[PDB]
Amino acid sequence: GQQQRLLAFFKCCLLTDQLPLAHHLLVVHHGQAQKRALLTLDMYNAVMLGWARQGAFKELVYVLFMVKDAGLTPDLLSYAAALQCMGRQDQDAGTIERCLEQMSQEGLKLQALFTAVLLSEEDRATVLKAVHKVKPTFSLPPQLPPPVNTSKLLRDVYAKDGRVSYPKLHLPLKTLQCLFEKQLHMELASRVCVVSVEKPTLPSKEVKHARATLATLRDQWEKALCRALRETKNRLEREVYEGRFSLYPFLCLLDEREVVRMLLQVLQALPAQGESFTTLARELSARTFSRHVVQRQRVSGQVQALQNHYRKYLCLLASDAEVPEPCLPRQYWEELGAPEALREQPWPLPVQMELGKLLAEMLVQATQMPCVPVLYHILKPHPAYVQLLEKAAEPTLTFEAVDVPMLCPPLPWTSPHSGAFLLSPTKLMRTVEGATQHQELLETCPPTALHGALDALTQLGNCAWRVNGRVLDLVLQLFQAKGCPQLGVPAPPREMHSLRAEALYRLSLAQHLRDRVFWLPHNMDFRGRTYPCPPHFNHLGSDVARALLEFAQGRPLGPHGLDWLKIHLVNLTGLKKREPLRKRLAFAEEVMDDILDSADQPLTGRKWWMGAEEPWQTLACCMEVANAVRASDPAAYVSHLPVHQDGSCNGLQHYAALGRDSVGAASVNLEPSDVPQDVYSGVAAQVEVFRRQDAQRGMRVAQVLEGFITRKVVKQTVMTVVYGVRLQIEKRLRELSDFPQEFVWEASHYLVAQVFASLQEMFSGTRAIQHWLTESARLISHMGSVVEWVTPLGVPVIQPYRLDAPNTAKQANGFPPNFIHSLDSSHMMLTALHCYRKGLTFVSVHDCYWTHAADVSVMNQVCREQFVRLHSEPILQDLSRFLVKRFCSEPQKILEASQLKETLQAVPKPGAFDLEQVKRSTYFFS
């Protein structure tokens, strides 16, 4: 604990150029025997590096003398730093020769020092200049091409074959450069004012009085916060000289005015309900770190180097510019020469928490509101303050530049730490829980294994997005004047105000991005799932958000694209959902008049779209069907709107493929069919028979649920049971007012149990695979080991559930769903990478694959192909061998590891289902 803080303290002092300050602490700690024991070679090297950059040869020699006094043998870092300081001071050749004589005798080879001990380019250059001055020639190692993954699944993606057509964005290179400059200013400020879409309040004395009081209050808060920052900085500095670890350099990394402004912005943004103190502290620490990194890059010229590099990179992503040899974005960034920043790595979690907590305490204490403190400590905004904000109705609402989607193409994920936002540090793992373990597995793993995940994430991020003007205007009209809950636009009206605020933020961002093209990067999850980095405007949020968001890129519909759009509209409405595709197209032809009338008069018309399950998506597809038919050639028409191709229960499909089941294949459309089979309906029928049995039993849950087990409710329960770790299922039951809501929770639980039993009874492969996975997970957790496994792609995935040791039951039940999510992510990533080779634009929303109408058929075929290949590869056998080699090889717990050996060895036997027919399955992703 303390050692990590001390190491963080010394690295932070290098960034603030507070070398005397850091050295004073080091000397005091060295004097104390107990503190000296904590002191380590890495800390000594950090002080050495700072003094070497400062060029203080005498100070560096004193640090080396301290190293000898401790008795530690100087490492490669120590010698690289001594050489760099010698270069900085252009010291005589004899001293450099004596330093190289001390090296290797007690400093290892100079080649090893250059290859390892990664340092800033200035540090390397100074060390090399010293070596050049000294007699040795240094023998700089030559550069070697980056390793390329040889895995069979990824072989096609990473092959050197030239028959590839990588997509290029329509926007010109110069326009992309201007967008880059706008994004760079956004990152610089980490704050962008966005106009509110709420109807402006009439100007009045009370509203104006509230605004004037608020402005005076903000000025007072600013002054008090600045005074508090000065006082805290002085106290921390006094502690540092005294000899006690402080957060003074952490506070100095960012300017006092900037820290005060960020604190005031957090106070403003804090919602009426409030936010957890730990979350707020984490947010403040991460923000301080991001703004510091931005400042360091601009002052040190990393921003200038980034401008040059990124401008060169844009040629690949700009249609007008051309690159002679096609490459993936990460490969391009690597061939150009990734400028890896050292600061990219974050502070230790204790230090981050301490900093965030201190800033939050400063905000709470400093801010005072006449009735006293604005913030109450689970921080709660003062009720009068919330009322004042409501009366003021400020036109502009400031959001974080990270929260807003980037106006520039996302930077390639050359590494987990270095990707997405160019100036703000973005970790690859979305999940906060078990973040350290999640990324430790990623880093230990060879880079080639994670290349596929990085490339897929970059490809999903690269896709352009634009808002729909017509949909946005109609939604604004409904939102501003009252609201339509059934349609999905929140009314002004706990949950209600939060929903209204969420709609306000999303619509405000859409208004800000009224006609600009915005790029949102995609951040992975432990389950390998892909989630957009922008929280406010991610497409996953809602149906209205999906309707607003359409691909900026324009794709010709093609000969069958119009048919795909009409089928998509029928699917979106949900009418005739389990009938053949030809029938769905025919139904679209039958309901075309309603389709057009909805497209033309959403508010005052037939309003047929409102009846459909997804009203806004139905309206958007209506608009694109109207535009298609109106256009002289529908095939020529460019349809921005995404076309979605989900595949029933993907997890159930994975289970049936993993353990070959003929009935399972037929039920989940893994076997060629003409009459599509609804899995949800079959499971509902089994639930109904079990319902009759329970009705015979004393329990009345069945009599309560009679006639109240709809396909939609069974759908939610099936998804939860398979690819879920219950709230949605109970909510579905609540919607039915007729259904006795006295047993909503009881009914949800009973439904979950019955659906799980039904799924196991109908599907032999599903029951066998689930049973083996659950038993293996339980017997792995038994040894205090969280069940980790490598996906077929090669990405490490580790379950993060912990109890303050692994929980045997949480891991045991979680493992089948997490494994299913890992397979789903692997299948989606293979589909995305192959589609990228084809040139298709692929984005994954939840479990649904989204692409342009022309691209739907090719995406479907790629999906089928990848699925076949994936399952044909021995997923079960490889998992069994992997888990044996990992957990079973445990001398400490060998006694139960032998029983785990037996359990893993008894893999579920495959049945008799041919995977090849999946390709010929029409309804697999229809």
DSSP codes joined into one string, 896-921 = HHHHHHHHHHSPPPP-S--GGGGTT-
Instruction: Please give the Cα distance from 260 to 847 (Å, whole number).
Output: 42
* Helix, strand, or coil (residue 831): helix
Chain breaks in the chain (C to N over 2.5 A) after: 371, 377, 493, 725, 804
Helix (H) or strand (E) holding 192: strand 192-195
Q: Which residues contact 486 (CB under 8 A, 6 or more apart)?
A: 610, 615
User: What does the buried/exposed string (b/e) look like for 733-760 if buried means 16 or more CB atoms within 10 Å of the residue's CB?
Assistant: beeeeebeeebbeebbebbbebbbebbe
Assess contact for 343 and 253: CB atoms under 8 A: no
Place of tokens 């604990």: 1
Beta strands in 245-383 (DSSP E): 375-376, 380-381
- Return the number of other C-beta atoms located less than 10 Å from residue 674's C-beta: 9
Instruction: Please give the Cα distance from 53 to 50 (Å, whole number).
Output: 5
Q: Is 646 labeled as catalytic in the residue annotation?
A: yes
Instruction: Please give the Cα distance from 848 to 238 (Å, whole number).
Output: 57
Q: At what angle do helices 349-366 and 205-242 cross, to 10 degrees?
A: 130
Q: Is 838 labeled as catalytic in the residue annotation?
A: no
Instruction: Please give the Cα distance from 766 to 759 (Å, whole number).
Output: 7
Q: Which residues contact 658 (CB under 8 A, 6 or more apart)?
A: 765, 769, 871, 875, 876, 908
Q: Which residue among 11, 133, 715, 901 is the active-site one?
A: 715
- CA–chain centroid gap for 135, Å, is 51
Resolution in A, one decimal? 3.2
DSSP one-letter string for 554-611: --B--TTHHHHHHHHHHHHH-TT-SS-HHHHHHHHHHTHHHHHHHHH-SSSS--HHHH
Q: Is 600 labeled as catalytic in the residue annotation?
A: no
Instruction: Please give the Cα distance from 808 to 814 (Å, whole number).
Output: 10
What is the C-alpha end-to-end distance of the chain, expressed in Å?
A: 54
Query: Which domain range does residue 504 map to?
Result: 1-926
Q: Which residue among 646, 712, 838, 919 is the active-site one?
A: 646
Total count of domains within the chain:
1
At position 121, the amino acid (one-letter code) is E
Q: At what angle do helices 383-392 and 205-242 cross, to 10 degrees?
A: 130
Q: Which residue among 35, 182, 847, 919 is the active-site one?
A: 847
* Helix, strand, or coil (residue 674): coil
* Helix, strand, or coil (residue 187): helix
Q: Which residues contact 350 (CB under 8 A, 6 or more apart)?
A: 1, 4, 5
Q: Tokens for 366?
A: 């400093």
- Return the number of other C-beta atoms located less than 10 Å from residue 383's C-beta: 11
Q: Tokens for 234?
A: 């002085």
